[PDB]
Design a protein around this ligand. Structure first.
Ligand SMILES: [Mg+2]
Ligand SMILES: [Zn+2]
Lengths: 147, 94, 170, 1112, 110, 56, 221, 14, 55
DNA sequence: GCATCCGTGAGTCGAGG
DNA sequence: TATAATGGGAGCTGTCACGGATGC
RNA sequence: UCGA
């Protein structure tokens, strides 16, 4: 980018690469149900490991896994996003066998269903906000006060 | 740009919350025939017709202009929804 | 594919303010048509909705009052302009439409860089946000004058270029 | 006006007939003017010779064929939407081998489309053009193995679908392998099958060290040709029983059979030249005296071993070299499809010979023409290389006819097309134009034939050269292939010549494409002209040498897009090709012989020749072309005018006095104006509209059908339910709009009524019916109206009825009506303009005359172009054009400046001085001195170093004029433009892309069947597609509600869209959206895949999105 | 019949079926028209007494969907068929007067 | 003198200090006067404007 | 005051190369093989090319065009991949509270491997501007507090301190180190670069990151 | 691979 | 209720039969004259539904 | 462990027919 | 409702990177 | 096939 004269902030590339490092491979199950060589999210294995550590069990031995954007995209938890990306047959078959549940965490799933995306004005942070004028606010406050 | 947009962004912790507040308020004004406005008759947004100045039909314009006056309260869980609805239907019949 | 949309050939907008675009009358009429029917009923131009629509159906049955009615309709509202390919979010921007005679969409010079639009015959699509919510979104967030700087480099996207620079430097 | 012409180069030969690549090909393929006995083995005659005789009556043989006359002329075919074609009869004879009985008959095979005089076709009323196709010439090639350096691959390639490619490669284990239909097998086996003995292979191939030892296998020589043959048949055909006759049949069909395997005549020649041998037939081998006989394989293997060893005289092959790439013209493609259809008919013939009575059979009973007809009709209708003709202007048709495509049937697939095929090969010189080619994904695949280029009988492109002997340049012209051209040193056409002798001791020449400086003693050949390096379109660009190749490409392309103008005029500056183009395009009417013109009329020109015979030439008037541009001829002569042979009679469309006129000559100033010319936008004077410059006629065709239905017949009638006289005013008695009426959007072109569908009136309908006391009519209004943003004056009405003479429609159709609506288009904001140099832009502003920058004498300019457009585009040709056009504006003359032999700078300077004398001296005679503003500008220019200080005002003004710059006054102020501005005459065309055609908008409209989403397209009154990327845009903006609005209310949510519309017309805010229909479609389509898709709540309990409609 | 998947311009771009409008499902304009029609019909039937309005609604079948005879409406309200046919007549005629005066229902007649 | 970079920096600094509304007004101003002056300035392109230096 | 010179200098139009082609020599050209012709075009467009020269040019022109044509598809595909991998990432909260961070180097090893040298200003800016400090930084008598969003002036200051040898690297909150699930926090992301202020929670930065990377893609040569 | 060939084989068995 | 999740799994033949409103017996679409759905065909109204609203 | 075949992908809108 | 008839026939293939199964 |  610098070579071609394009000014671009590192943070974006960092976002992508962050999605590339999302996965890990098990080097030993310990006390878990996981299998040696099994691949899963770093998050879920950290959760499983803190749950096993809090339980006094042996944590899972894992190794960092670096994958490219295509594989990382196809490897996500949401089957709607994956199936809509590409290799639809594979994604669909594997997901259907596993009886997978898409939790609609991302944008693409909600876009498929035509729901309100969990971003911007649809973010659960800002979407429940209310607006009331002082006249109405006091009119309700009096009803609250009389009871 | 929208007049006083910097101040509006200044009011909120997330720009999207500003958008939500403005839209909801505009819906309130639309539903109630503007009867609930916090704007004095001089502060009323005006459209220029062939005849002359009339009330600005745009509820969003009204919403932002109201919001600028600080006469509105925004936030999360200020009141049960149905309560707000019915109290506003009482005060301002539509 | 969506409703309340249209497209046409773009043309330079030099008179337009940063927040504005020239929108042809015919396009505007068709796009806003239900609002125009309602407004036509509010005023004395038609007894009801259906008579109004039947009135608009033929071109020679269109009279002058309907245009002022249309002008009353669009007031304060914005439309979305989009040029393909849309590479980043600035390939879509919001503008207050200003009705113009002629069939071409007028586009502000300063947003030409973000759209990567020039005058060699590029075309743009128009979309109409309906709900108060959609319009509030487009007006606060998506307004051309509300995004000055690149989401990518943080540097100004809308800046003087071509003749502007030429004149100022001169 | 007088036409001055420049340049020192005298063209020896003229440009060959420009459409000949089509005409001569198709003629050669037909031979309808040739008596059947004198016809050659090329063409459909060849196909007949290949297909017949048909055996196993028993024998059905071919004698001859003939083509009758077309049942309809061309104009009538265009009228009735028929195909212009001639009936094909074939004389055949059935022969019983035993009986000896011979039954001969002439059978009708259906119709073959006939190419018109101009080189195009008419298919179903539509003019079409069959584009030539470039491909790899058949032959034997040798290319380096990418994986194994030092090792090479042999490839034997026949004509497309003439049988398999074959690969000879030397394996890592040393054995020599052959690949056929993706099967690797040792070549030694097949060699044995050919009857080769270890002795012969040892003596022939032994010379090369250790290579022949990889060819040595004892187990192969241990079996006779039969055993080896059956072995090979077992190798290439797993599971199929290895019968002797079946093996012989398969191998024969694969290798020796001419009816299956055919190298080109070209392929044969190339094989002979490369391998240094001679081929009896066109196959790889033969069947002679019961055994197979080698032709190709052994010399090929020899060459492969020689190349691999490093034996000198054996080189690889460049497959992009124009000697190895040939051209399949219309004749060859049509011939191929003819061969296919014929073979189908042959299969049908044997199938017919098996069945039926063996005694009584006639050629009529055996032959079913249907498959052949199907093949031909399919080729002319649905083929890739059969394209809707571009008629926009004559140059469009001409160029379209000269196109070369690397795609199509038998051609490359886009995925297989890399840089190589798209590149400009060194051998393209004089053959394929380096400039003209599409921008975008099609680049390099579609090309144009060079101006002087010729395609020989083999299919290779040849370019003319001049023989040079002992430093003397002859008038002898030699057309060479690329392979031939590579043999000589060839000097450039601009090489200085005194008389016929080369005048310089250092000349610029080419050896195998490489530029080299040589002596006149070393010059074998010399270019005919620079014109031969470029296409026709590229050769229409003056000062091409001053333009960068990309913008040159753009202008070259944009010339075909020029819309014919009513006032259209030839360029002030031409290349001198503007005449030949109009002539070869058959756009303009010409005089056949010498004589006197008897009659001149708008519709007609009658000429008496020297023979005394009266010839009446009709004139095409206001005919609608494919793209809808008006095509009409106007008479250029007058009563009693004496005319010679080849003299102009009528000017075709886009023509002025026999010269090609693609646009207007306008007076331009180059300078920014108030941001209105910003980024390629253009500013025009209203004076252009006033005098009707850039105005064009456009005809649009509307059609309708009244047909028989099961609810009762539709009918065209003036009786339309619920319509006043206001609506029916311009309709005639029969319900068809009158000729000459003015139609606007919503108006009725053709009245039509159709019986309503079976209708259960909803209670509202019944109650309203009763209220207004009116019976609901049987029919309803289907009438064809004017589409939004269309209309004009009706110039024609055609009506065809069932049961009327000469009229038979498709089954069920009662009547067909066509309304033709003309419209006259003035230039307007949003319309596209361009010059020949690649400068293009849409008009953004039209200023009233008083606002235009003007000359001191008060003359306002026409167009204002932004100078910022020049420097990065690097096309300077438009500047020189403009200057010389200023000169031509004042002297009142036009010029001819050929590309690479163009009007140089000093000459333009001279003409500019001569112009200045007129532009100024006139003023000084009128009794006017220099203006104050002129003085200010002159001070500004003195500071600019533009003029020499100390000179008089007039001297400096002239100094500016010689630089092509003048003083300009702002129309709004009266104050001068601070600097001198470049002003002159430029040739600008109005292109076909016009905002009137391109503007569209929709509120709501028709929807797709399955998805319930808006239809696409302007013609369908459909919505704009909001794609994945626009969804990304909205997401990135974080506007959730606008996006959700797009995904539901605006497209596929039926409940949501209905509710939304009702809410808006009622004046209420739009309702919360529901589940979009296409998601339900997704769910169902997944259920059809036996996959259970359940939408669940947070409690994991199913939620019905079908609302119980889908649950029992 | 012909395949909806038939290509028109070559292959990938579009299908023959992509140009075919759906004539079954009512356009939003149509549904809105029926909505305004039902609403305006109720607006016209509110200017009549509830009995004659109900008689008209039964006779035209705006209630249960089907149109009753004179004997069934006569047995529903408890009068003679002549009486109910005449109530239907006076209701229809009062609707004629209301319509001629206001001119609200004319447009829907197409 | 004011060229692309300095104008861009002006726009950025104006954004930071005075906010986007005022920045929009500034941009429109610059557009106006820029076009205005570029029109009357006398900028053009002649063939002699491309100068072959002797040193060549 | 020459038009070409002015247009080039101001940045209105043109670069030295195109100007050279108009005035000085057109220059060397490529053979189709990528190999360069030993004989350059000595002509400008002002003078005009010989037909042979023009022909030599068309190789390069065509190669360029075909190359761009083939490139835009790859750019598009890349962009789509990026969008699909980044789409679920939105700013979900104010702080994930992670104590982790990344250290942006202000210095890079020289190619001679002789010493370390200061990075180019553009690059430092590209890794610094609009980012929250994960630790206290005291340089040039100025305190930059933990949690501070670095403005452009902050970055220029840090560069100045780097030149004076006070700081060789800057600790910074980054999306790499953010512990927010299904997204990033506000502090790790820093500025919303369009508004030059801290990013508003709920902004979907995944699509912005992908679009930001994708758009220039056809410009890369 | 090819059902026709396979069936012709299975037919050639009897 | 609101849809918070989408599950995909295999359909047992019993489930497939539970979905069905009937078995299509004949490979027939519509009648060559009446142009109406054939009985026990792919378009049969007896299975998939009425062609006209409430009829 | 390392050649090889198989399946999978390969830019967006818009126009014409 | 009856001579006897018994294994098909198309078929040009100028791209590339990858992942996963397979073959020595 | 064409336009960006
Ligand atoms: Mg463009
Ligand atoms: Zn964080």
């Amino acid at each position: 980018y610098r070579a071609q004269g394009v000014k671009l902030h590192d943070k974006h590339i960092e976002i992508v690469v962050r999605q590339m490092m999302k996965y890990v491979e098990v080097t030993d199950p310990g006390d878990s149900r996981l299998l040696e060589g099994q691949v899963l999210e770093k998050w879920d294995v950290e959760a499983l490991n803190e749950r096993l550590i809090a339980e006094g069990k042996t944590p899972v031995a894992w190794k960092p896994l670096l994958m490219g954007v295509t594989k990382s995209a196809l490897s996500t938890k949401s089957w709607l996003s994956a199936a809509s990306f590409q290799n639809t047959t594979h994604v669909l078959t594997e997901a259907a066998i596993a009886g997978k549940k898409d939790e609609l965490i991302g944008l693409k799933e909600n876009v498929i269903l035509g729901r309100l995306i969990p971003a911007g004005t649809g973010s659960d942070f800002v979407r429940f906000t209310q607006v009331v004028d002082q006249k109405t606010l006091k009119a309700i406050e009096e009803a609250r006060k009389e009871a | 740009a929208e007049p006083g947009i910097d101040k509006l962004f200044g009011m909120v912790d997330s720009k999207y919350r500003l958008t939500v507040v403005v839209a909801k308020r505009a819906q309130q004004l639309l539903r109630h025939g503007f009867k609930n406005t916090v704007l004095e008759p001089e502060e009323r947004p005006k459209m220029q017709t062939l005849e002359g100045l009339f009330d600005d039909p745009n509820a969003v314009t009204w919403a932002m202009k109201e919001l600028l006056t600080g006469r509105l309260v925004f936030g999360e869980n200020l009141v049960p929804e149905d309560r707000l609805q019915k109290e506003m239907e009482r005060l301002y019949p539509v | 594919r969506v409703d309340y949309s249209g497209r046409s050939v773009i043309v330079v907008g030099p008179q337009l303010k940063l927040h504005q675009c020239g929108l042809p009358k015919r396009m505007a009429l068709e796009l806003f048509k239900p609002f125009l029917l309602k407004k036509m009923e509010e005023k004395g131009i038609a007894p009801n909705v259906k008579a109004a629509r039947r009135m608009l159906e033929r071109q020679r049955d269109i009279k002058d009052e309907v245009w002022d009615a249309l002008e009353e309709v669009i007031h304060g509202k914005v439309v979305l302009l989009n040029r393909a390919p849309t590479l980043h979010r600035l390939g879509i921007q919001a503008f207050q439409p200003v009705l113009v005679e002629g069939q071409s969409i007028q586009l502000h010079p300063l947003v030409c860089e973000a759209f990567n639009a020039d005058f060699d015959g590029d075309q743009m699509a128009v979309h109409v946000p309906l709900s108060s919510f959609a319009q509030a979104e487009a007006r606060i967030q998506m307004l051309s004058a509300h995004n000055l700087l690149s989401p990518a480099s943080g540097e100004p996207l809308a800046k003087p270029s071509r003749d502007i620079i030429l004149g100022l430097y001169y | 006006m007088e036409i001055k012409r420049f340049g020192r180069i005298r063209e020896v030969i003229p440009l060959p007939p420009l459409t000949e690549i089509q005409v001569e090909s198709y003629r050669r393929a037909l031979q309808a003017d040739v008596p059947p006995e004198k016809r050659e083995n090329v063409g459909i005659q060849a196909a007949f010779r290949e297909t017949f005789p048909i055996e196993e009556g028993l024998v059905l043989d071919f004698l001859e064929y003939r083509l009758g006359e077309p049942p309809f002329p061309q104009d009538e075919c265009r009228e009735k939407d028929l195909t212009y074609q001639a009936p094909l009869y074939a004389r055949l004879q059935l022969i019983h081998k035993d009986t000896g009985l011979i039954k001969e008959d002439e059978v009708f095979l259906g119709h073959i489309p006939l190419m018109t005089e101009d080189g195009s076709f008419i298919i179903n009323g539509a003019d079409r053009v069959i584009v030539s196709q470039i491909h790899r010439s058949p032959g034997v090639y040798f290319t380096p193995d990418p994986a194994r350096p030092g090792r090479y691959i042999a490839s034997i390639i026949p004509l497309p679908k003439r049988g398999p490619w074959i690969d000879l490669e030397v394996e890592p284990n040393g054995v020599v392998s052959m690949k056929v239909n993706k099967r690797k097998f040792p070549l030694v086996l097949l060699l044995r099958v050919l009857g080769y003995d270890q002795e012969t292979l040892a003596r022939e191939l032994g010379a090369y060290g250790e290579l022949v030892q990889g060819l040595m296998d004892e187990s192969v020589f241990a079996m006779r040709p039969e055993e080896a043959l059956i072995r090979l048949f077992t190798l290439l055909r797993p599971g199929d029983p290895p019968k002797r006759d079946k093996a012989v049949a398969y191998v024969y069909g694969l290798i020796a059979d001419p009816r299956r395997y055919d190298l080109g005549e070209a392929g044969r020649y190339k094989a002979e030249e490369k391998l240094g041998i001679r081929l009896s037939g066109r196959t790889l081998a033969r069947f002679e005296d019961g055994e197979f006989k080698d032709e190709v394989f052994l010399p090929t293997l020899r060459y492969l071993f020689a190349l691999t060893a490093g034996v000198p005289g054996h080189e690889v092959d460049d497959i992009d070299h124009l000697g190895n790439r040939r051209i399949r013209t219309v004749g060859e493609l049509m011939t191929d499809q003819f061969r296919v259809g014929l073979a189908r008919l042959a299969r049908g013939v044997r199938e017919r010979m098996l069945m039926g009575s063996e005694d009584s059979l006639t050629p009529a009973k055996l032959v079913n023409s249907r498959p052949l007809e199907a093949a031909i009709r399919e080729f002319f209708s649905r083929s890739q290389l059969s394209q809707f003709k571009d008629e926009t202007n004559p140059l469009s048709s001409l160029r379209h006819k000269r196109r070369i495509s690397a795609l199509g049937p038998g051609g490359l697939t886009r995925e297989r097309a890399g840089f190589d095929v798209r590149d400009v090969h060194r051998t393209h010189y004089g053959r394929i134009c380096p400039v003209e080619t599409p921008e975008g994904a099609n680049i390099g695949l579609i090309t144009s034939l060079a101006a002087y280029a010729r395609v020989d009988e083999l299919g290779f492109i040849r370019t003319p050269y001049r023989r040079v002997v002992g430093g003397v340049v002859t008038d002898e012209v030699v057309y060479m292939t690329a392979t031939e051209e590579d043999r000589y040193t060839i000097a450039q056409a601009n090489t200085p010549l005194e008389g016929n002798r080369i005048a310089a001791e250092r000349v610029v020449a080419r050896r195998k494409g490489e530029p080299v400086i040589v002596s006149p003693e070393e010059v074998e050949f010399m270019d005919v002209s620079p014109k031969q390096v470029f296409s026709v379109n590229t050769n229409l660009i003056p000062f091409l040498e001053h333009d960068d190749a990309n913008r040159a490409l753009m202008g070259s392309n944009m010339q075909t897009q020029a819309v014919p103008l009513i006032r259209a005029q030839a360029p002030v500056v031409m290349t001198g090709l503007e005449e030949r183009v109009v002539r070869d395009s058959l756009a303009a009417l010409y005089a056949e012989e010498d004589g006197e013109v008897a009659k001149v009329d708008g519709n007609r020109i009658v000429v008496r020749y020297e023979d005394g015979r009266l010839v009446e030439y009709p004139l095409r008037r206001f005919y609608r072309s494919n793209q809808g541009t008006a095509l009409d001829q106007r008479p250029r002569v007058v009563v009693g005018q004496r005319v010679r042979k080849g003299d102009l009679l009528a000017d075709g469309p886009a023509s002025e006095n026999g010269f090609l006129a693609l646009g207007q000559n306008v007076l331009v100033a180059i300078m920014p104006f108030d941001g209105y010319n910003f980024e390629d936008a253009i500013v025009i004077s209203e004076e252009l509209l006033k005098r009707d410059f850039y105005t064009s006629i456009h005809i649009e065709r509307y059609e309708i059908e009244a047909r028989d239905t099961k609810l009762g017949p539709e009918r065209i009638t003036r009786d339309i339910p619920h319509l006043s006289e206001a609506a029916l005013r311009d309709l005639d008695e029969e319900g068809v709009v009158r000729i000459g009426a003015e139609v606007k959007p919503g108006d009725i072109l053709v009245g039509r009524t159709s019986f309503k569908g079976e209708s259960e009136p909803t209670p509202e309908e019944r109650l309203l019916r009763s209220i207004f006391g009116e019976k609901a009519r049987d029919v309803k209004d289907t009438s064809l109206r004017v589409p939004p943003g269309e209309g004009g004056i009706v110039v024609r009405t055609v009506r065809l009825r069932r049961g009327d003479p000469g009229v038979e429609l498709k089954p069920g159709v009662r009547e067909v009506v066509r309304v033709y609506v003309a419209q006259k288009r003035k230039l307007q904001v949003g319309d596209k303009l361009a010059n020949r140099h690649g400068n293009k832009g849409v008009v953004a502003k039209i200023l009233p005359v008083e606002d235009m920058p003007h000359l001191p004498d008060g003359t306002p300019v026409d167009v204002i172009l932004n100078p910022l457009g020049v420097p990065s585009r690097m096309n300077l040709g438009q500047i020189l054009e403009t200057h010389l056009g200023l000169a031509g504006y004042f002297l009142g003359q036009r010029y001819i400046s050929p590309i690479f032999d163009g009007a140089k700078e000093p000459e333009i300077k001279e003409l500019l001085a001569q112009a200045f004398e007129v532009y100024f001296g006139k003023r000084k005679g009128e009794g006017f001195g220099v203006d104050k503003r002129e003085v200010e500008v002159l001070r500004r220019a003195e500071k600019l170093g533009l003029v020499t200080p100390g000179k008089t005002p007039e001297e400096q003004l002239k100094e500016l004029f010689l630089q092509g710059k003048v003083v300009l006054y702002d129309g709004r102020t009266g104050e001068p433009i601070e600097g001198p501005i470049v002003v002159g005459q430029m040739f600008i065309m109005k292109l076909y892309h016009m905002v009137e055609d391109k503007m569209h908008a929709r509120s709501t409209g028709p929807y797709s069947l399955i998805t319930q989403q808006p239809l696409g397209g302007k013609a369908q009154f459909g919505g704009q597609r909001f794609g994945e990327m626009e969804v990304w845009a909205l997401e990135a903006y974080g506007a959730a509600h606008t996006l959700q609005e797009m995904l539901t209310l605006k497209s596929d949510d039926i409940e949501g869209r209905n509710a939304a519309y009702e809410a808006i017309i009622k004046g209420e805010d739009v309702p919360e959206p529901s589940v979009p229909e296409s998601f339900r479609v997704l769910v169902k389509e997944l259920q059809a895949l036996a996959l259970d898709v359940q939408t669940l709540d947070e409690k994991d309990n199913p939620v019905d999105i079908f609302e119980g409609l889908a649950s029992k | 019949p012909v395949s909806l998947e038939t290509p028109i311009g070559d292959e990938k771009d579009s299908f023959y079926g992509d140009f075919i409008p759906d004539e079954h499902l009512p356009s939003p304009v149509d549904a809105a028209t029926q909505s305004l029609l039902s609403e305006e019909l109720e607006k016209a039937l509110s200017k009549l007494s509830e009995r004659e309005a109900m008689v008209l609604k039964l006779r035209k079948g705006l209630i249960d969907g089907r149109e009753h005879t004179l004997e069934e409406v006569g047995a529903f309200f408890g009068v003679t068929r002549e009486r109910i046919r005449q109530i239907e007549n006076k209701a229809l005629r009062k609707l004629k007067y209301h319509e001629s005066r206001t001119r609200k229902l004319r447009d829907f007649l197409d | 003198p004011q060229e692309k970079n300095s104008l861009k920096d002006l726009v950025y600094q104006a954004f930071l200090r005075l906010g986007m509304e005022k920045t929009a007004r500034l941009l429109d101003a610059l557009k106006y006067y820029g076009f205005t002056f570029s029109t009357t300035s006398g900028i053009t392109i002649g063939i002699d404007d491309a100068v072959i230096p002797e040193e060549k | 005051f020459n038009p070409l010179y002015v247009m080039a200098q101001s940045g209105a139009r043109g670069n030295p190369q195109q100007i050279r082609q108009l005035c000085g020599l057109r220059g060397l050209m490529q053979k189709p093989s990528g190999e360069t012709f030993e004989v350059p075009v000595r002509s400008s467009f002002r003078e005009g090319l010989t037909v042979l020269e023009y022909f030599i040019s068309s190789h390069g022109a065509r190669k360029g065009g075909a190359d761009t044509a083939l490139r835009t598809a790859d750019s598009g595909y890349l962009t789509r991949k990026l969008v699909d991998v980044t789409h679920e990432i939105v700013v979900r909260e104010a702080d994930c509270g992670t104590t982790n961070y990344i250290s942006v180097p202000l210095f890079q090893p020289d190619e001679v491997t002789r010493s370390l040298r200061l990075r180019k200003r553009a690059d430092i800016e590209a890794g610094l501007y609009g980012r929250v400090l994960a630790r206290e930084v005291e340089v040039l008598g100025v305190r930059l507090e933990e949690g501070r969003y670095l403005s452009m002036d902050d970055v220029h200051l840090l560069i100045k301190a780097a030149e004076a040898g006070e700081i060789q690297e800057v600790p910074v909150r980054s999306p790499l180190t953010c512990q927010t699930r299904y997204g990033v926090c506000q502090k790790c992301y820093g500025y919303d670069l369009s508004m030059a202020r801290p990013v508003s929670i709920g902004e979907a930065v995944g699509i912005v990151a992908a679009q930001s990377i994708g758009e220039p893609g056809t410009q890369l040569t | 691979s090819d059902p026709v060939r396979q069936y012709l084989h299975e037919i050639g068995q009897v | 209720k609101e849809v918070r999740k989408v599950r995909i799994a295999l359909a047992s033949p019993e489930k497939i039969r539970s979905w069905s409103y009937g078995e299509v017996e004949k490979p027939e679409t519509i009648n060559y004259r009446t142009l109406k759905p054939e009985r026990d065909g792919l378009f049969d109204e007896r299975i998939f539904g009425p062609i006209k609203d409430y009829e």
